């Protein structure tokens, strides 16, 4: 009927969810976010794309080449991603008087589940609700990532992916995210002199090569890290909320409100 935990226990719980999230996340490390929009916002504008217009008139005076705008105006609804857990009042009493850890294992478990869920969302949108998957986004620039288990392996595929991106006039500092099998099987120590394959790939990429288990067995993607190609609109970060006492046991729920809008669906390549 009241707010059970005090300031110190609130702080411990919140820092636990914060730390577990900041450790577990790979999506926040590759995309930049539209400013925290507040709770009230529930829809955002969309993208702009395939506006193939040379626009290279370059005269004295000016001609009338067309302007760039959203290809077709529309909106999307920011989902809500949550996990739930429970606490027992006698345990709060004990933590208050007898022994004083206040076990918060459940918060850690909930935060891990929520973060895993949202990464699966970012790399694979929900089919039923209807969103975009980074391995299923339309206009995806396929390139065979096969023929590994060779001395010169993944380098020959990353270079091909980069030329494919760059012929689309879409370049910059690139980023790579790889499945666990491929990423760990990449330490074929030698290219020729002394350099690990991962680190020379990184020199070619210049924005990190990450591993995320959420990917399938034999797959990975490479993107152009800039904004104005991809985005991550947030309405609030992962936080903890109280669901009101029920049968004297206290429930709780961890929240996060996210959506990615791939503005320019040209910076994507796959297997």
């Amino acid at each position: 009927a009241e707010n059970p935990l005090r300031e110190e226990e609130w702080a411990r719980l919140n820092e636990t969810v914060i730390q577990v999230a900041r450790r577990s996340l790979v999506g926040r490390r590759i995309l930049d976010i539209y400013g925290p929009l507040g709770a009230g916002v529930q829809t955002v504008p969309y993208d702009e794309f395939q506006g193939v217009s040379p626009g290279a008139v370059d005269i004295v005076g000016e001609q009338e080449t067309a302007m760039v705008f959203t290809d077709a105006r529309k909106f999307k609804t920011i989902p809500i991603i949550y996990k739930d857990f429970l606490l027992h009042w006698r345990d709060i009493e004990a933590a208050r008087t007898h022994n004083m850890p206040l076990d918060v294992s459940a918060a850690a478990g909930a935060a891990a589940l929520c973060a895993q869920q949202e990464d699966e969302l970012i790399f694979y949108g929900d089919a039923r609700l209807g969103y975009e998957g980074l391995m299923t986004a339309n206009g995806r620039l396929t390139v065979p990532l096969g023929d590994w288990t060779s001395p010169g392996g993944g380098f020959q595929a990353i270079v091909e992916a980069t030329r494919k991106l760059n012929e689309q006039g879409h370049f910059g500092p690139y980023a790579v995210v790889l499945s666990p099998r491929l990423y760990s099987q990449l330490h074929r120590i030698y290219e020729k002199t002394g350099v690990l394959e991962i680190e020379t790939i990184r020199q070619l990429a210049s924005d990190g090569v990450y591993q995320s288990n959420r990917l399938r067995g034999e797959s990975g993607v490479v993107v152009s890290t800039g904004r104005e190609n991809m985005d991550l609109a947030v309405s609030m970060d992962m936080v903890a909320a109280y669901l009101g006492a029920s049968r004297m046991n206290h429930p709780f729920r961890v929240l996060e409100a996210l959506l990615l809008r791939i503005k320019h669906p040209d910076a994507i390549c796959t297997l």
Partner: peptide, 12 residues
């Protein structure tokens, strides 16, 4: 008045 942000300060 400001809408705080906690976890997502990861670069790029």
């Amino acid at each position: 008045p400001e809408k705080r942000l906690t976890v997502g300060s990861l670069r790029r």
